[PDB]
């Protein structure tokens, strides 16, 4: 049976960074579609893009640095082939921002800061190589710690609704996850916002919490209708707070009234039913 | 129905630190019982000790440092009362070792290293206060990054089978999770070992993977017999690799033959059945 984790959203984690969920929100009116690569697990558990099954892989990079280039591997130590997705599994998916990664090694001391600019030509995570940017030689495992305004183009401010250019220019098939659109019908996408550390009120959006991804991947729901109508139940009282709908590509949408930013975070998404994709939602509230 | 995540162990995470699982092993012969506080979720989903439901809280501390003491809060920002367990939820559970924590802030830059000695008198996480050890004033969220040999008693080497002295001296009830023992019958406890970064081959043992904890917490299995016989199935082939048994306090035990360190990590613990606690196991192999 298809099921979503019966845990409060306050207790789950974002799927694009290892962080607690702080809000449920919608996208700014300038952003129609988003193309996140992490946090992309269809309702039948088929992980697409660079989404791992556990949070111990989310926003983590492992590889061997030559002093000039980090040859990326998978996090298990084995080599990476462009065959899987746009980058090694769990690769950070934050566009319009500079990454900052805490790097450690098995067998050594002394964690080290790794500042990553995702615009330059040498950032080609599809060819299994990112720029070292001063990280010394050796095998490293790093996790995303905090983000910053991008270095290029200077003057632009953080837009976490984009994804980094994964290289893989004209000829190759990029294995990028397909864009997800608002299913039209006066319906807007719903994003789980987690507070990212960074010089500003950074609310990182993810399409599904990570525990949701692991539950869908471990469950592998055989049956998917056109969409899955959800309610956001408040566990202390048991009153429905507003209906959402999950589309099979693994996102939730809702029609706000002016909502979803007005909903609490201590609720629980209970899978209500299987609905058609034309099914009309009641506004949030 | 009681179910364990149908994901390979290589893809799950340790419950005492945010790390991938690398092996399945047993305890040294000098260690009979272990008293881990993280990674303690009974088979009916009752989280005990300082175990959180998501990995976004495991081995994380949040609090306000006065320059001399970190007044610990819960990770959601709300104050901490000794009422829950021995320390705030998700507090690190690594005994016999010095912690090292990467600390960040919402709204600021510049991650900072926080070195924690768990022996001194001012390390009283039950009273909601640990030593600042140079961490500047302010509200911080930190995650465990790497470990080290303890500073006291000097000369002792890493023994990850202990837990830190959580303060809470003679009078108070410490809310410590009860010790878990080998149930006898020649059975020995089985530990999921993850490689911790640190100046040595640190294999951190946990009783259950974190995704197991979240699945048991979200599922809340109503029915628990005396024990749950498990098999460790290899997913590519489908051959059982050796039987374990899960006791209701949330651990697995097995009789080695000389095993469980000989088993691969790409298998999947499938809950086989409900057995009595006297049920005799076949040796690993």
């Amino acid at each position, epitope marked *: 049976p298809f099921t979503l984790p019966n845990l409060p959203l306050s207790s789950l984690s974002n799927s694009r960074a290892p962080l607690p969920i702080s809000s449920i929100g919608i996208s700014p009116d300038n952003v129609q579609s988003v193309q996140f690569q992490n946090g992309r697990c269809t309702l039948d*558990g088929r992980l697409v893009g660079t989404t791992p099954v556990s949070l111990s892989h989310v926003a983590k990079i492992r590889g061997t640095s030559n002093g000039t280039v980090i040859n990326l591997t*998978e996090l*298990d130590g*084995t080599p990476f*082939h462009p065959f899987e997705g746009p980058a090694p599994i769990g690769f950070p998916d934050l566009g319009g921002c500079d990454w900052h990664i805490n790097m450690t090694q098995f067998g050594h001391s002394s964690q080290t800061q790794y500042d990553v600019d995702t615009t330059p030509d040498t950032f080609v995570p599809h060819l299994g190589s990112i720029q070292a940017n001063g990280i010394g030689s050796g095998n490293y495992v790093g996790v995303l710690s905090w983000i910053s305004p991008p270095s290029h183009p200077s003057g632009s401010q953080v837009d976490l609704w984009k994804i980094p250019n994964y290289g893989s220019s004209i000829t190759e098939a990029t294995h990028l996850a397909p864009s997800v659109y608002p299913p039209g019908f006066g319906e807007v996408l719903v994003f789980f916002m987690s507070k990212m550390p960074g010089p500003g009120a950074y609310n990182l959006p993810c399409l599904l919490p990570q525990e949701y991804i692991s539950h869908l*991947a471990s469950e592998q729901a055989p049956t998917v209708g056109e969409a899955a109508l959800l309610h956001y139940v408040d566990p202390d009282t048991g009153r429905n707070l507003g209906e959402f709908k999950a589309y099979p590509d693994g996102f939730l949408t809702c029609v706000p009234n002016g909502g979803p930013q007005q909903l609490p975070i201590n609720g629980v998404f209970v899978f209500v039913s299987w609905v058609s994709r034309f099914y009309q939602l009641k506004p949030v509230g | 129905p009681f179910t364990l995540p*149908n994901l390979p162990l290589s893809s799950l995470s340790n419950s005492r630190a945010p790390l991938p699982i690398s092996s399945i092993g047993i305890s040294p012969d000098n260690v009979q019982s272990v008293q881990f506080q993280n990674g303690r979720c009974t088979l009916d989903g009752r989280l005990v000790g300082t175990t959180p439901v998501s990995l976004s809280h495991v081995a994380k501390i949040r609090g306000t440092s006065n320059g001399t003491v970190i007044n610990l809060t819960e990770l959601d920002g709300t104050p901490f009362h000794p009422f829950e367990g021995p320390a705030p939820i998700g507090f690190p559970d690594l005994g016999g070792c010095d912690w090292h924590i990467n600390m960040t802030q919402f709204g600021h830059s510049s991650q900072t290293q926080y070195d924690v000695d768990t022996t001194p008198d001012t390390f009283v996480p039950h009273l909601g206060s640990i030593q600042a050890n140079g961490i500047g004033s302010g509200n911080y969220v930190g995650v465990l990054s790497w470990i080290s040999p303890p500073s006291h008693p000097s000369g002792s080497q890493v023994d990850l089978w202990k837990i830190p002295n959580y303060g809470s001296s003679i009078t108070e009830a410490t809310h410590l999770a009860p010790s878990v023992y080998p149930p006898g019958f020649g059975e020995v406890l089985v530990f999921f070992m993850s490689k911790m970064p640190g100046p040595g081959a640190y294999n951190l043992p946990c009783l259950l993977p974190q995704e197991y904890i979240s699945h048991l917490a979200s599922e809340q299995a109503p029915t628990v017999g005396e024990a749950a016989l498990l098999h460790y199935v290899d997913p590519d082939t489908g051959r059982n690799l050796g039987e374990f048994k899960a006791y209701p306090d949330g651990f697995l035990t097995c009789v080695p033959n000389g095993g469980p360190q000989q088993l691969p990590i*790409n298998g999947v613990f499938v809950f086989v059945s409900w057995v009595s606690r006297f049920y005799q196991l076949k040796p690993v192999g």
Partner: antibody
Amino acid sequence: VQLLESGGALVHPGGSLRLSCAASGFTFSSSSFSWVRQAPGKGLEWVSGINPSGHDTYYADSVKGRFTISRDNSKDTLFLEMNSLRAEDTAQYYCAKKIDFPFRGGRRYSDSRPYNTGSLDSWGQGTLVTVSS
Amino acid sequence: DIVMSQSPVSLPVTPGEPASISCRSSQSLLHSNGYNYVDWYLQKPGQSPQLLLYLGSNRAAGVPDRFSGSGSGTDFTLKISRVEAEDVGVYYCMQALQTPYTFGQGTKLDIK
């Protein structure tokens, strides 16, 4: 992925030897391995192979019944013992790790994907076994 | 079992000019999944074999885009778009469909 092999030495025809391949830098427990050999001046020839659990071992017809492949998951080691050697087995022996693909969804998804695929991504440097008198 | 013949035994090429190494299998290497379970290995002079291509056309870790896999069914072509000096060596087409994994006699790609 580093795979270091050792044990190759001159063996009397009919003697025995034991070649070990110690692995470092990756989860050894979840990787399939294979022993391949290159005769001096000839092409590559695949000798044997072993799965992660070590219960499935495959042998070439020229060495079936005389070579034994096994693995110690604890010490991260792969083993090939050789009994009743012949001069035909004079060759350099490599331990190669078969390609792996990240989890990516489960067995409903992965049984239509080419994940077995036989291909050897990482190789060791081989140890030379000369069988002579 | 599967015998993998190759052509030619030696392929003399000039640096920069695209080279085609054919490999023909006695059995069809087209699997039901649509992938050709044929790998292309490069053993350079004095080194251990390294995987260039796997599953017909896919490139391994660190393989530049000049190596291409073409062909299907039973006959496959390693196409080197711009032969460099780093590519000299013996190219083996290994069947990966079934054990015993049989390698081809190899083509000694040499540059003019």
